[PDB]
Each structure stands twice: as structure tokens, then as C-alpha cells.
Ligand binder design. Sequence first.
Ligand SMILES: CCCCCCCCCCCCCCCCCC(=O)OC[C@H](COP(=O)([O-])OCC(O)COP(=O)([O-])OC[C@@H](COC(=O)CCCCCCCCCCCCCCCCC)OC(=O)CCCCCCCCCCCCCCCCC)OC(=O)CCCCCCCCCCCCCCCCC
Ligand code: HEA
Ligand code: HEA
Ligand SMILES: [O-][O-]
Ligand SMILES: [Cu+2]
Ligand SMILES: [K+]
Ligand SMILES: [Zn+2]
Ligand SMILES: [Zn+2]
Ligand SMILES: [Zn+2]
Lengths: 196, 459, 65, 226, 107, 121, 180
Amino acid sequence: AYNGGYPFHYVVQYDDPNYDCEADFEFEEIPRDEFGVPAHIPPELSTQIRHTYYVPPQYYPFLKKLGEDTPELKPYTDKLIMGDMTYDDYEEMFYKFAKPLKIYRSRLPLPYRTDEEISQEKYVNWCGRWYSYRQRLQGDYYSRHYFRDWLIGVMLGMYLGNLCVQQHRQYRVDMKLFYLEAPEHKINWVKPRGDL
Amino acid sequence: FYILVNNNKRIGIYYIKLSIIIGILGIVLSYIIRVELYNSGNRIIKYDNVNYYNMVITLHGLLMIFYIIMPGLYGGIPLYILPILSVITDIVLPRINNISIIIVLISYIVVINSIVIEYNIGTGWTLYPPLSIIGTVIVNMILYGLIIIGISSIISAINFMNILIVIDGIIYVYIWSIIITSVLLIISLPILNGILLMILSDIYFNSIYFILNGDVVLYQHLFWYFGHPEVYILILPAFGIISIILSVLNNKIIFGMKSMILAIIMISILGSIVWAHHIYTVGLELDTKIYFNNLTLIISIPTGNKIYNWIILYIGSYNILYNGYQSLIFSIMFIIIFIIGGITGIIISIDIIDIGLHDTYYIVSHFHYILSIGAVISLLAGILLLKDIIGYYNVIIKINKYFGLLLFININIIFTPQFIIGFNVMPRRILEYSDNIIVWNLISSIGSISTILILLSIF
Amino acid sequence: NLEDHFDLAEYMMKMHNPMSEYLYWIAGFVSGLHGILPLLHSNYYFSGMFLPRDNDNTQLCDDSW
Amino acid sequence: YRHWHRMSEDDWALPLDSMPEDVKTLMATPQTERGFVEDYWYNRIRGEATLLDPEALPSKSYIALARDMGLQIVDEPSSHMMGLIELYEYLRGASFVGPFGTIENPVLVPAVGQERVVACTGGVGDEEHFTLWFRCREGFMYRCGECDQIFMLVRLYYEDRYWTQTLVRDTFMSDGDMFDLKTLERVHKMWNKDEMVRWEVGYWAQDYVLGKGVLPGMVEEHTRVN
Amino acid sequence: IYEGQTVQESELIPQEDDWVIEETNFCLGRNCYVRFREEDDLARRALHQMDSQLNKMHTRLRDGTVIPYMSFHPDEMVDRPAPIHTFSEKPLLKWTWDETYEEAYDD
Amino acid sequence: TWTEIWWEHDPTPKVAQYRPYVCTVESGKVYWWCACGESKTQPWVDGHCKCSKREGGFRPRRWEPEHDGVRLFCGCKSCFSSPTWNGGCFTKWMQSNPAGGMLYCFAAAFGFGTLTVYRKF
Amino acid sequence: KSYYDDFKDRLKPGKYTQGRCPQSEGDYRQESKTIGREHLNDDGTRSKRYTVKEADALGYHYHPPIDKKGQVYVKGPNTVIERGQTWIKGYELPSMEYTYGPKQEDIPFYPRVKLNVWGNYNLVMKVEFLFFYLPTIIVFGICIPVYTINFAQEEVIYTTMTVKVTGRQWYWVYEVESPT
Ligand SMILES: CCCCCCCCCCCCCCCCCC(=O)OC[C@H](COP(=O)([O-])OCC(O)COP(=O)([O-])OC[C@@H](COC(=O)CCCCCCCCCCCCCCCCC)OC(=O)CCCCCCCCCCCCCCCCC)OC(=O)CCCCCCCCCCCCCCCCC
Ligand code: HEA
Ligand code: HEA
Ligand SMILES: [O-][O-]
Ligand SMILES: [Cu+2]
Ligand SMILES: [K+]
Ligand SMILES: [Zn+2]
Ligand SMILES: [Zn+2]
Ligand SMILES: [Zn+2]
């Protein structure tokens, strides 16, 4: 499920003991995999073939001792003795008996605090709660005061704006009377200067 | 070593250092402009050397945008705190971070060298053709600088995006601000490169895109398709800083964190689709104009939500804490100033209002209030907040109420009168003007000399 | 080492040579000159004067000076 | 762990060319004086010598069998240390989530130095607050200013050294009876005869005890070209 | 929205009638520019700077626990000025849940 | 009204005066402000009020001016910027005499309306 | 009181501008000859040889710190066994007077207070709704005006005269129909 199923690292075997894939340029040697499968047998077929680990029989008594001392480990050891342990079975055994590292808080040295100070812990917590109570209430109080004040700014900005509305209103009245009544408006007055 | 260092925090310092250096050249150009505009006549530029003024305004704009504010707010503060905010040891791409700052310096040297050696002519920082393609070699040099700068910007954007893969904590609002600016750069820069290559093709390869039967308005579409996303690539990091400062100094958790984040995302998407509000007077189709005007006004919604969320951060904060720190004052001043700039932006967004106010000093004052005042103050406020972490000294800024007051008053003396002359009307990108506009121009000029004097008191 | 703990340790511990600061300010000063010197050079090249006299491109009264 | 990259070939076994050539001294070196490579081959030679002697395994106790293979019998001291080591390693690329800390059971913050940056997010649900970062220095019982969650720093320090698997094995494992080279020879003749080598490690090991080049085919095995 | 930790009335009941809110000063002290001795060299001035870190300070309560210098963001957790290598040991963001497993307990 | 209707576990001061006390203060000197309103050396602690005796949760409020000058100080003992005055004395008075508060607010608003309308019109 | 007078003695006014004698009077550029200071200059700054010319990151002075057992020196905690328990005493930083100078007395009181949070979820949600939808209403109030004025500019009008205007560098050409 990673890298397309290609293992990042894998074992390759060569039949010729003096073979070097970098020095030689021959075209007859066929590499094998970790289980010994020749490269010309595709993965889809070889992965179906069942491969089991065979330990020398002299190890059977040791594998038996392991099972008895740890009964949860016995089924895996039995498979290994009987030549029924595949790579997947080995992996299941490996991860089943892995445990996490443990941290003990009782071993941590503590920052220095006198016995007088240690007896005041409840008092300091009490002060902290009252500070949080006063903080939360003040938030409501302040939000009401300042957002209400912003209305004064709206009203002040509406008064000052209305002053320019009135000036504009009077301006339009004046403009309507310019071409109609204003003596400043003159017709048949400007004469062409002519080219210099 | 000095140039070989890959430390992300050292490189962040380099970005701020270089922004101040290049900034000196930027401010000097601004003083030239305002001195010239003090009255009508020629004051410091001869009538036979009017091409120099055109170059001064062009370089002023380009340097302040791409070589000062962008390297300062997107390269400086980001490279210093972002890996710390992300509880990561260092930046994901160490070697790329080193080359980015070196690239910025090399492109700066090319630009200034082109001033000294090439004939001095100007075509605006927007390099509109056909004027840009009928100029002298100084335009070619400026194009090389922009393309080189583009390389540094994109690789830095790639660097910040990789933090998502390594961030070991929570993506704070500021981190979200940089990531979205990085996305805006990745999507906008490739389009800019293409149109810049076409400018080069017409300048250097006998191409004919910007001569008759080829539409010059094409350039404006592709340029501004990067142009407006650029103005939000320059402001969004500033917003991220403002959020941190207000929460930290007021000891108040950010209110509506997810709405802040979703407001930044919204501004980016909308900012990527409203570019043609810069092309209202060309003669686009009625439906196009209405689409762009409609979507441009929508950007105010997410931008407005952020402003009000900032206000409640400052409201209710403890009175015992001293509120005269320069960083806090600058952060508060940003809200007051940004609203002015944004509201005037909404005014110019109405195309019919824009017909009167396009290519007038009202537009100048609009983007100065946001950049020359808002962005600068945000960068100052951010650096000031990190004074202990950065460790710089030999300046009197941290607690200096005189500097803040004088800066605020005098900066407004410069640009508030530029709103007035926009209805007078005084066109932009001009040096001579009618005698009846002297009063306001004179007042703004008095403001410019005064602001410069206040920059000397910090030392 | 303790000396290597802090980035730019000499500056942060306030032992750096002042020449480093002088170079930084000089570099900024040179950057500023790139806007003024070409102004003077270009003015002289096209006019013959390094800087104009206010309103010398317009008609002036007889007593103007 | 998820943060580790792919197993190397060495992670499974070492090449026989890395076997120390002075096997006689290798099998007599105390465990505290054996390096990583020397310790690998001491355990492999001794462990495979006992495993390849089937007739003696059933009469060998688990205490003796574990010693031969180089496996450390666990105890509360060593378990505590190993556990805190593996917890430190896990937290290198994993989130830090657990029960709410109280005075009786503080949040345990493993560290090698005297300080580690820690953030408190409060309790579960509505009791969760914004990240409050603090520097957890040793010797102080920290209390969050917001939720009153108790924190404590645990240092993996032992006798001017930090805790490692090698340190735990050296401090608690005790060397048993000195390995007898006669066992190596006896097992060697058991599985290696008449040009068949069914204990390659014991054929190389016996060759080195003999002086290198003594056994058939070993001169040819040691002759390389580059 | 966050509105503080929830409190049950039982937790607000004092064990004595004289209990009031502890009046411990959370102002760390009077500070200014870190002042280095002339005699100290670069190495010894580094030690001086490391001993003046506000983020290493705390306030000890009546029960011996200490409330540390805390910040909303980890930017305030590195030494000031920032050293070349800051978070060698990965900062741990502690999340809380109600899940538990039997292996952690003993009967 | 936090002490009056919301929270009953904070000390509640007595109003000494619904107007600020004007005092000349000197930089580099520390002043102690009465938080109970029963001191006879207002606005300062007299050594005999609740604040001086640390009674009922009342403690003196430390204050220090940055520069020399004349500063306004809170008489109502509830101003947000206490010990300094910011107008809370008038606000607290309106809570205690809401009819009077309306009269002043109407008068202030009336003047503001007339002047702003007269100039802009 | 004046706190500066408390640590006036520590601050002896300086003699040299920028704290160094002329290089002629003392050569601070050279590496110090003092044993154990080969990596420092005479004035105490790090020598260019140590940091640049022979930087260890470049392969100079190769010296692996970790030992054979994969261990490095680690300083242990201050352990104090007591009351049938092993305790660790934390390291308390020195008085801020030693590091900063001011005497740590008459400190203003800043009490512990939990975070200042906005309460009343229902009220807060309504405000956030208004923070978003009040601007939305204003935009909608401009939308209709915007459409109308746009339609007005682009209105098919019965024009009776045409003036052609060409812009050239730098003058405006005008073409007008001549009366017949
Ligand atoms: C916007 C402005 C206002 C802003 C206000 C607000 C500011 C808010 C606060 C901002 C804070 C930001 C963060 C700061 C972090 C600082 C970290 C830091 O200090 O890092 C340590 C870093 C280095 O310290 P370090 O670790 O001890 O480094 C040891 C070295 O690596 C090794 O030591 P070394 O001695 O071995 O060093 C090597 C040294 C060796 O040096 C020497 O041997 C020097 C010998 C003396 C030379 C002196 C100059 C001579 C000039 C002659 C000119 C003649 C003209 C003749 C004209 C004739 C006309 C007829 O240098 C070199 O070899 C290379 C030097 C290259 C760089 C200098 C370039 C100068 C300009 C060149 C222009 C060329 C144009 C060519 C055009 C060609 C066209 C064809 O510090 C610096 O580099 C200095 C930084 C100082 C400022 C820090 C910020 C303070 C706060 C702000 C103050 C306001 C500044 C305003 C801007 C400036 C206005 C002008
Ligand atoms: C960082 C810089 C920056 C920022 C943030 C903006 C923001 C905006 N700009 Fe931009 N602009 C520039 C920099 C910037 N601009 C520059 C440099 C140019 C000129 C380039 C050139 O031509 O050479 C320019 C030009 C420019 C024009 C061209 C005018 C012309 O060419 O004649 C227009 C018009 O559409 C415009 C509109 C806007 C709008 C609508 C916003 C919005 O983002 C503003 C949003 C903010 C607010 C609206 C205020 C906050 C919100 C509220 C208070 C909520 C309540 C408000 C409402 C409900 C309206 N800008
Ligand atoms: C962010 C970019 C930026 C900044 C800071 C400024 C700052 C200033 N600009 Fe700006 N200006 C532009 C970008 C900027 N400008 C652009 C893009 C144009 C249009 C270009 C074009 O028309 O083609 C323009 C045009 C422009 C003109 C129009 C000339 C014309 O085309 O006719 C004028 C003069 O009226 C002017 C004046 C000023 C002044 C007086 C200042 C300031 O000097 C005001 C005073 C403020 C300061 C002196 C502080 C600035 C300090 C820093 C920037 C350094 C910050 C670094 C750190 C904090 C580390 N500018
Ligand atoms: O550009 O907005
Ligand atoms: Cu735009
Ligand atoms: K002029
Ligand atoms: Zn907590
Ligand atoms: Zn009293
Ligand atoms: Zn009062």
C-alpha cells in the first residue's frame, strides 16, 4: 500500500558465486528473490505460492521453551516448529508483543516550592476563579457601553453630513435661478477675438 | 562576512537599510518637484531642461514604489519576523533570500547610473506608449531595472509561500497578509513581464504593437492588470503590521481574526479584477465602465470591516499604560489617515467624478495619503515595535511626541492643498501652471521643506 | 561562542567602529547627489547656467533683480 | 517517525568490511569504551554465536540470552528515560496535544537545555484562548495568566550529558562474563566446513583472530582493486 | 467568541472569611537602556545582555507558582536583540483535548 | 454604573466633588490621590481616610507628572483616566441628577448647533 | 528622588571621541596577542581572520564538537533534595538595578488582570454584521446613481455639428466644417 507494493529495500540472490551485476555484461544469469523465486516467475504467481520458514530441528526444543514460558506466544512457535509460519505470521507475532515505553511522573524532580507556599494552592485557585468571573462580566458591561457610544458618532456624523445637504440644497435653488433671473448671465456678449 | 550572509534576520536588516538609502534619493527628487512648483516661472529647472523634470517625477514614482516601500514592507519586516512568527528556525530558501537583496541593489545601481550617463527624459512611472517607445536609452535602462526587480519580487514571493509547508504554529493575521501578497505577486508579475517585453520589442526589436493598427490601449490593460494589484501588494503588509501593533500594545486579542483574514483574501480577489478604473477616460464601452465602477466600490466593504475591527482593538484598553509611544501613535494615525485616502478613492471611483479628477493633483493627494503617509508610517511603526528585537539605537524616535505631531501636521500641509487644486484644476506631471494656482501650490511647498527638516531631528 | 550568539554582536554590544556608520551615511549622501548633480549638469548643458534665476523665463520689470 | 526519511541499508545491517580487524581486543573491550561500530559488531558476533548454538539455548536464561544479544532488560529508571527520549523525538515533527495541566499533573515540557518556548491555548471548546507564548525555564512551576494551566519543564540531563539510547544503555547495562573466543571457534566449525560458510560473520571474525588471511578464500576476499 | 474561562459558583466559595484578592505587583521593575560596563569585553557584554531579558522574568504567586512574561506572538520570545539561531528546540504549542488512553494510568 | 448595578465586589467611592480639582504639580515628585473621597486634603490622601488606612479595598493611587504645570484631578473618584480628569465627573453627575444633565446637554448642543450652522449655512 | 544619582558612579564620562584612541597611539586593528584571545582584536572586536579569512564554515580549523558517544557537555540543574523529594531551584535573573542601573524601589503597582475581552455574543454578532452590511448599504446607495450618470454620458444625441480635434507634439489641431 506504499510505493506501488515495491519494497524500498529487498534481498536479491545470484547462483554464480563470483557474479557482479555492475562489472559483468552477460545475458544469461537470472536473479532470484529473498525466498529464492527466479525472476522469470512473475510476482502475481510467486506471491500466491506459500513459503514457510524451516529452522533446523535442533531449534525445536528452544522454540518449545518459548511457547511454554509465554502461552500467548505458543501458537506462533508451534507454527514455526511445524513449518507453517509464513512471513505474514512472523509479522503478526512481532507486532503482537511490542509494548510502548512507560514514563513515571513520580520520578520527575519538581520546581522548588516551600511548604508554606504549597498550603496556599487553594487560595490562588480561588483568586483565579474570581478573576475569570470579573473578566467575563466586564466583557458584557464594556460591550454595551462602547457599542452604544458608537451611536453618538453616527448621530454626530449625521448632523455634520446634513449641513452639507442643506448647502447643496440651496446651491441647486441658486443654479435654477442663474439662467432665468441672474444679471450675471449675459447673452450676445462675447465676441470672437480672432487670430493674433 | 557581509555580502555572503544567508541569515534571514540579517537580510531583513539589509532591506530596511537599503530602503532608507534609496529613500534619500526618493525624498530629494520630491523636494525638487515641490521647490519647482513653489510659484510660476522657472525656479530650479531651466525651460530648456524641462525633460529633467519629466525624469524627476518618473524616477520619484518608480523608486518610491519598487525600490523603497515594497522592499521595506514586503522585504524588510517580513524577512525578519515571519520565520519567528512561524516558530521555524530560519527561512525555507536561504540562498534565494540572499540573492534577492543583491538583485535589488544591482537594479538600483543601474537606474541611478542611467541618470548620470544617459540623456534625462521622462515618460511617467506608468511608461505609457507610444511616448515610452520613442524615447532615448534611459527608458531602456529603466526597463532592465524593472525586469530585474521583478525577478527579485517573484523569488521572494516563492520563498514566503513555502512557509505554509513548514509553519509549526498558527498562521497569524500578519502571516496571512504576506502570503496573500505573495499570491498577488505570483499572478500579476508574469503579466507585467509580458507587456514589458512588448515595450522592449517596440524599443529594441522593431516591433509594431504600439503604432497605428496596433492598440496602445492594450498596454494600459496589461500594465494596470499589474498596477492595481501592486497598490494592494504595497498596502496589505502594512495592514498586517497594524494588526500586530494594536493587539500587542493594547494587550487585546485580535477581534474577528477570521474576518480580518477573510477580508484580506477578499481584497486580493477584488483587487485582481478592478484594474480598469485607471482607464476610465480612454473611451471604454458603457457596460465595461459600469462593471469596473461597480466592482471598485465593492472593495470598500472588506476594507471597511478591517478598519472597524482595528478601532475596537484600541477601544477599552487600560488607561494606566502610557499611550505616547511612537509606535502606538503611528498605528492610530494610520487608521485616521487611511480613511481619508480610501474615501477619496471611492470618490474618484465614480467615473463621472473621475472625468473631472483624472490626471489632476487630487489623484496625487489620494495615493500620497495612503502611501507617502499611511504606508511610510506603518513601516516606521513596525520597525519601532521591533526596536528591542532589531537592536538599533543612536536615534530619538521611540518616545518623541514632537516628531509625530510635526510629521502629521506638515504632511497634511503638503497633500491637503493638492485635493483643492484638483477642482481648480491643476493637471499632474506638469511644472508650469497658471498664476491663480500659486497660493495652494506655495502652501504645499512650504509643507515639503518643513517635513524634510523634521527628518533631521531624529538623529 | 558567546561573541557569536548575537547577530552583529559588535554593534549590538556597542563596540563597533564608527566608520561603519559613517559609510552608511555617506552612501545615502551619494544617493541623494544623483538627483542634484545631473540637474546642475543638464541645466548648464542646455542653458549655460547651473541654476536659473526665479522667473527668468518670463518678462521682467526694468528694475527687477 | 513521520519526520524521518527512508531507512538506509545500514539501518538494517552493516557491511562485513566494517568489522574491526582486531577482533581479539574488540571482544574484550568494556561496553562504555566501545564506539558505535565496535558496539554493533560486538553484539552481532556474540549474539549470533549464542543463537547459532541450538543445543545450549534451552538451558540459557532470558537474562543471559538478552545479555548475549545485547538487549537491555528494562526497569523503571531506564523506561522513564527512554520514554521521555522518544516523546522528545516525536514532538520534533508532531503536534503537542494532551490533557489540561494542573498542579497535581503539570504539562510536561521536555527539553535538553534549560529553557523551551511554550504556548498555552487554554482548555477545550470555549475555554480555548489565543496563543500565549512564554519561555519555560527550569525550576519554576509556571501558571498561565489566563486559564491558570500549570506547566513544568522536564530536562533530559544525566551527569553532564543529555539522555540518549547510548547513554541509557551504558548507565544501566552491566557487562557480564567476558566473551570466550573458544565459543566463536566452536560455532565457526559448526556452520563453516568444507568450503561451505553458513556463518559468514564468524568466518570473517575467526580469520581476524587468526591474523587476517589464514582461512581459505579470505586473502581473495580482502584483495580489492580500488 | 472568547469570554474567559467558565466559573461554577462552588469554585468562588472561600475557605476563610478574610480571603481577598492577592495584591502582588505585576510591574517587573524600573528599566532603561541596558547599561554595559566598560571593563566587560564582547563576551562578557553578551552575558550581561542575556541577563537583562524581560521575557525571562516572572511573578511568583502566594502558592509558589509563577506567572511568566507572556505574549500573543512568538516574536517576543527570542532574546533581544535577536540571536543568529533562535528556536533550536522547536517551540511547543500545547493543545488541550478530553481524549485519554488507559496506558497513561495505573491502578 | 459598574459598581452600582453590575459588580458588587469592587470598592465603591464617595463623590468628594462633581468638579475636578486644579493643582500645580512638579516633575520628579510623586503624588498620592484619594480613591475614597473622604480625605480632607483633596485631591490627595491625608493619612486618615480609607486609602491611607488600607481599609475596605481602598488604596492611594500613585501619580507622577512628566512635566511641571497645572493639571486637573478627579473629584468624582470614578473618572476613567483617574487620578487625572477627563470629564467623568460631569458624566457621573448626570447619573445622579439626570434632569440637570439634560439641561446642560441641551444647552451645549444648542450652542454647538447655532455656531456650526451660522458659519456653514 | 533622582534615580540617576544612584548609579552615577558607574557612568564615568568618556575621554575619546567614539571611545577609541587614534590608531597611531594604539593599533586596535591588529589581533590581540593575549593568550585565549586569538579570535579578538585589541579593542575586543572579532578579528577578520576569525570571521572572514579563516571562517570555520569554510572548512578552516575543522573541529567536530560531538564526541564518540554522540554527546556534548550539558550543565545540570541546581538540585536540592528535601522533604523526601528531589527539587530543582530555578535560576532567577539578577536585580534589574545591576543590569539597567535604576534602584528597584517605589515601583508603580500594575495588578494582575485577565485579558480584556468583549462579551455578549449576541450583541457582538450584530455589531459584526453591521460592520459589514452598513458599508454594503452605502455602496448599494451609490450603485443606482452610478448607473444613471454612466448612461447619461453614453446617450445617443441628435448632434448637428462636428469638430475634429487632433493632438500633436505639442499643439492641438482643429478641423471644422466651413460654411457653404
Ligand atoms: C530616510 C532617512 C531618515 C530615516 C529616519 C528613521 C530611521 C529609523 C531607524 C531605522 C533603523 C533600521 C535598522 C538599523 C539596523 C542597524 C544594524 C547595524 O548597525 O548593523 C551593523 C553594520 C555594520 O557594523 P559592523 O558589524 O561593525 O561591521 C563591520 C564591517 O563589516 C567591517 O568593518 P571594516 O572597517 O573592515 O569595513 C570595511 C570598510 C572599509 O572602509 C574604509 O576603509 C573606509 C575608509 C574611509 C572612506 C570614507 C568615504 C570617503 C568618501 C570620499 C568621497 C570624495 C568625493 C570627492 C568629490 C570631489 C568633487 C570635486 O568598508 C568597505 O571596505 C566598503 C564600504 C562600502 C559601503 C560604503 C559606500 C559609500 C558610498 C559609495 C558611493 C560610490 C558611488 C560611485 C559612483 C561611480 C560613478 C561612475 O552597521 C553599519 O553598516 C552602519 C549602520 C549605521 C546606521 C544604522 C541605523 C541607525 C538608525 C538610523 C539613523 C538614520 C539613518 C538615515 C539614513 C542615512 C542618511 C544619510
Ligand atoms: C496603496 C496605495 C493605494 C490604495 C490602498 C488605493 C486604494 C483605492 N484606490 Fe487607488 N490609487 C493609488 C494607490 C492606492 N489606491 C495610486 C498610487 C494611484 C494612481 C496611479 C497613477 O494613476 O499613476 C491610484 C489611483 C486610483 C484611481 C485613479 C483615478 C484617476 O486615475 O483619475 C482610482 C479610481 O478608481 C482609485 C481608486 C481606489 C479605490 C476605490 C481604493 C480603495 O482601496 C479604498 C478603500 C478604502 C476605503 C473605502 C476607506 C475605508 C473603508 C471604509 C471607511 C468603509 C466605509 C466606506 C465606504 C462604505 C465607501 N485609485
Ligand atoms: C510610496 C511612494 C511615494 C512616497 C513616499 C512619496 C513621497 C512624496 N511624494 Fe510622491 N509620488 C509617488 C510616490 C511616492 N511619493 C508616485 C508613485 C508619484 C507619481 C509619479 C508620476 O507622476 O509619474 C508621485 C508623485 C509626486 C508628485 C507629483 C509630481 C508630478 O508628477 O507632477 C509630487 C509633488 O507634488 C510628490 C511629492 C512627494 C512628497 C513631497 C513626498 C514625501 O517626501 C512627503 C514627506 C514624507 C517623507 C519625507 C517620509 C518618506 C520616507 C520614506 C519613504 C522612507 C521610509 C523608510 C523606512 C521607514 C525604512 N510625489
Ligand atoms: O490604484 O487604486
Ligand atoms: Cu487602481
Ligand atoms: K514653476
Ligand atoms: Zn492558558
Ligand atoms: Zn481616600
Ligand atoms: Zn472624576
